[PDB]
Amino acid sequence: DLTVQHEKAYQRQTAVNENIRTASKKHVNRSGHIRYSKKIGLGFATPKAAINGKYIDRKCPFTSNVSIRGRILRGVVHSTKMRRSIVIRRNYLHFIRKYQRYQKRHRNITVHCSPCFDPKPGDEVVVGQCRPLSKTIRYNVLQVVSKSAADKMGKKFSKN
Amino acid sequence: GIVRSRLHKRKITGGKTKIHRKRMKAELGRLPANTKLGPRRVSPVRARGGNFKLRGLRLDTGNFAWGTEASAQRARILDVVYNATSNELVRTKTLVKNCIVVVDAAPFRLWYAKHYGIDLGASKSKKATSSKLKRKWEYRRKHHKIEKALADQLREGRLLARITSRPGQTGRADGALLEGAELQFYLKKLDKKK
RNA sequence: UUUUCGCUUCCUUUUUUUGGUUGCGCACCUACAAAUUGCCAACUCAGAACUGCUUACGGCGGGGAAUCCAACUGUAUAAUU
RNA sequence: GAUCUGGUUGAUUCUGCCAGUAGUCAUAUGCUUGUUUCAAGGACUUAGCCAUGCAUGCCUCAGAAUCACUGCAUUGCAGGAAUCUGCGCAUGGCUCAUUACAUCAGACGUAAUCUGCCGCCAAAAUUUUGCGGUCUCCGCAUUACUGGAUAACUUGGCGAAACGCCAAGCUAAUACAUGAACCAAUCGGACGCUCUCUUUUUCUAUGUCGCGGCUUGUGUUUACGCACUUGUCGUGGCGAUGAGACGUCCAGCGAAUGAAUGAAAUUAGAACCAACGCCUCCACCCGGGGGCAGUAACACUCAGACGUGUUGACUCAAUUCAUUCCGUGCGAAAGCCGAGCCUUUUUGCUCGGCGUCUACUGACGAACAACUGCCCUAUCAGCCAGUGAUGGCCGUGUAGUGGACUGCCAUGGCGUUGACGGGAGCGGGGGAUUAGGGUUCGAUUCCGGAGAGGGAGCCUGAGAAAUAGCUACCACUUCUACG
RNA sequence: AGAAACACGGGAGCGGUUCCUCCUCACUUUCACGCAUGUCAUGCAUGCGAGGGGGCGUCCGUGAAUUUUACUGUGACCAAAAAAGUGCGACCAAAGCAGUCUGCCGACUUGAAUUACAAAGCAUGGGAUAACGAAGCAUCACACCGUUUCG
RNA sequence: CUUCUUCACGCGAAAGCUUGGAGGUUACAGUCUCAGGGGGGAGUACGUUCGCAAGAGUGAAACUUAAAGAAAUUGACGGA
């Protein structure tokens, strides 16, 4: 936004030239506007935020333009210093056959995030591969997971 | 030649990145072409494996496509007005995807004028004409609202548009008229650097 | 809104105290966009082009590597040092 | 064979290391060899240097006389000198120089592409030409049809040489050229100045009614005439009963740009008004009033269609319009064998199996990419950001993705599970040896990779940086009558 | 880990039931240019016919759709290079795929079988592991069945 | 804190070994951690880092060698 269009320039989109005919009353003063959000690839459904939302973002595939297919990795968000792109950490235990033990290992991964999301390092996330999106990125964040749709909302009902 | 590699850049531990073998020809690209407004010299180049890609030097007319009116007319690219990037770029009239031009408008005028029957300043094909010309208008009057402003652009035949192809790649640029909010904005922007 | 914001009317307690009530004011952007815009304004640095060809005004610290010697700055034989 | 034994004491029991010991069928070498069977064999050091010698081509029946030559008495298929024709030539062989998350692997992505060869196929714009004439345009035509150079050869010739070389002169190709069709698909768009109800039967089909005029000021060669539509009126209608038709005019078949097209989510009551749709008095029809499609209908063959591509996954395909294009408009002006019938046979006319031959798919393959996994080493730790470092912006730019790269912007990114640097070899399959647990190797014959004079660079091709290709540089080398 | 909701396409289903004059062996308004069964070879004949309705308890496909869901180990399977190393007496050893044939101017007939830190996927399972429960207060100071409602 | 009587097998090469020793372990396995890994060369080297300054911290190879060690035992011996 920024009272539409935040950035220096709009974008075009693969779907934005206008069906200037339909004048739908603002239902409950909504209406609400068509968008490009979609069935999301090899399964699931986007946030309401895509469809209802009004950001933009090219590097997004979700509301936008890239395509995810192949491994879908899950990760802990590990860096968001950088804008609208995140980096998640994957710790994992690396087993030594001879010693019959495991040692802690990890690897960091930049994955682009669609703007409709909003995670913080730590956050558990599910990202998917894509044609390179950036030098470092061939992944795009796909859903920021959480527990019981709300992560502990009833046992937190605080004091005064 | 020039390799399209990520690999020669820092391995992002800062980590040095090194050489194994080749500068691979398959990843060899070409340095920036990009036409400059005027009369073509465009080269089909025998591109990867074969195949042509069109290598534009200079270009002059377009097919300005009326996004909101769905017919497109072939016309002058009368001029570039903005290159998002750069004042030099506009100045050099080196045309790129999304380059913002200025169109002739007469066809499009005519077109409206043909289609609906109506114009702004001229009358060339009006007089050619009950009526089945009674229709052209009946249609229009069923419902159009054009932009005013667009009309005005048409009067002076100098009308803004955005390119829908990658000239520097394709050698060709046609485009569709710049529009709306974006246009307002770009009008704003247009005015906001004096 | 069980407190020392204030007062009026009214109710309640004895009360023309309080408290409640009412009207208004007192604290509280909760009035809040952006500050759009208007105006005028500055030569600094920077950038880029265009351009071509010049140890050229001016003014402009040689450097290095060691040995001896004195820490240093200071001081001085007017008028050889 | 899951043992050791030999070696420190004055003895003694001890911790304990060396010596031996078993392999390695691993290298060298010494010695010493009956057969004979079964055998690897200049990696290693210097990817040192190299004479030498030798190590990509080939045609069928199925593109091309050339009078060379050859063939045969002669023909003469043939052959063919000797080429123009094609593919391939960029698997090899050789090596490990190179190399270290790079690469090898598992294991993957390629909706981020490009793909000769192949299977598996599919096609519609035309004019040719000829003729005739004539405008060189039209007309006509059973239309049968076409265009241009250049190898090899000849000569002359050049030169020390070379891969040294000209020069003219001579003729064919599925090479080059036009590409040539006058024949036919269902199929769009745009205009009208155009015309205004198509075919039949008793009982029967549809896709039927065309259906405006006057006329203000104003407008025709300065005295006729339309119209505008203000006004007025016609089938309602204060200015067009069109639909239908008849014509015209633009390709509707690749590509490109644009635009639009992309499921099977409540009960709306039902009502109004606008729509079609349907039925209703007659009359062959035209016409001609009615009423309905929602509290109600039964007949002239007489009230509510033939349309949801393709993956979990597309801004995918696939279609239309618009606008557009220096690859397709393969659609046949070329070449076998085979045969027909005419014709003698041939010409012609037939039929049959192959050639040159484009787009889309598939293989095929190649490019491109992650997750996972790899070896030494901290008196190696921080590394990392002139810009590319991390990311964010538009475009570039590429086969496409991507800082690949520009241009702008943010300020990042990585590391003590050790980053960075530095160490060591390509890396796997595997190899090797240990009861077991384990050690160690992996030059090389497995793969994958790598590489290729040193060094870079390029052209081409489907395809290589392509190494018995070029190009220039370094280092080295040959030849010269030393140009 | 399915399941509960909705929804949409195939539902005397794909399977299943239940009431009914379902009891009636022609389903169409047409197109249904079919089928089965025969002959005559398509001439002739027969037929396509409980249809249908009520009910379903209920099936299948699927959907855009409403709500709510850890790991690892083990299990099992799933997914693959040349191998010496795992296969038929090759004379036989080092090997092989052969070979069984006069009995074969011919038959029989081949050729077993095979494994890794790491692979994800799947089945379980709970033993152990992280995620969270942290932290208590919104719960008086999970929110609930859930009716009737004509308000 | 014991001492340590005294007891424990146990553990140990012994010497010896308690609170809950050097015990309860090749019948090898509670956690965490440091260290160690023939001997000599050297704990040193201009190796390197603290440190005013000693010097600490950290810390080699070359070179060399067949032992070095330990406890007990007995013996010998003693300016015991």
Q: What is the DSSP letter of B182?
A: H
Distances (CA, A) of A88 to A60, A61, A84, A107, A120: 17, 18, 13, 9, 10
Could you tell me which residues of chain A have a Cβ less than 8 Å from any Cβ in chain B? 4-5, 8-10, 12, 17-18, 20, 135-136
- Tell me how far apart the alpha carbons of residues B35 and B96 are, in angstroms, rounded to a whole number: 8
Q: State this model's resolution in angstroms.
A: 5.6
Task: List the determination method.
Answer: cryo-EM
The string over B101-130, giving b where at least 16 C-beta atoms fall within 10 Å of a residue's C-beta and e elsewhere, is bbbbbbbbbbbbbbebbbbbeeeeeeeeee
- Tell me how far apart the alpha carbons of residues B132 and B109 are, in angstroms, rounded to a whole number: 20
Q: What angle do CA B73, B77, B81 make, to 5 degrees?
A: 130
H or E element that contains B94 = none
Burial class (CB in 10 A: 0-12, 13-18, 19+), A6: exposed
- Tell me how far apart the alpha carbons of residues B83 and A67 are, in angstroms, rounded to a whole number: 29
- Tell me how far apart the alpha carbons of residues A142 and A72 are, in angstroms, rounded to a whole number: 9
Q: Three-state SS for A101?
A: strand
Query: B181 to chain A: which residues are within 8 Å by CB?
Result: 4-5
Query: B9 to chain A: which residues are within 8 Å by CB?
Result: 135
C-beta atoms of A4 and B84 within 8 A = no
Q: What angle do CA B127, B131, B133 make, to 5 degrees?
A: 50
Nearby residues of A13 by Cβ (< 8 Å), 6 or more positions away: A36, A56, A64, A65
Q: Three-state SS for B168?
A: helix
SS (H, E, C) A19-69: CCCCCCCCHHHCCCCCCCCCECCCCCECCHHHHHCCCCCCCCCCCCCCCEE
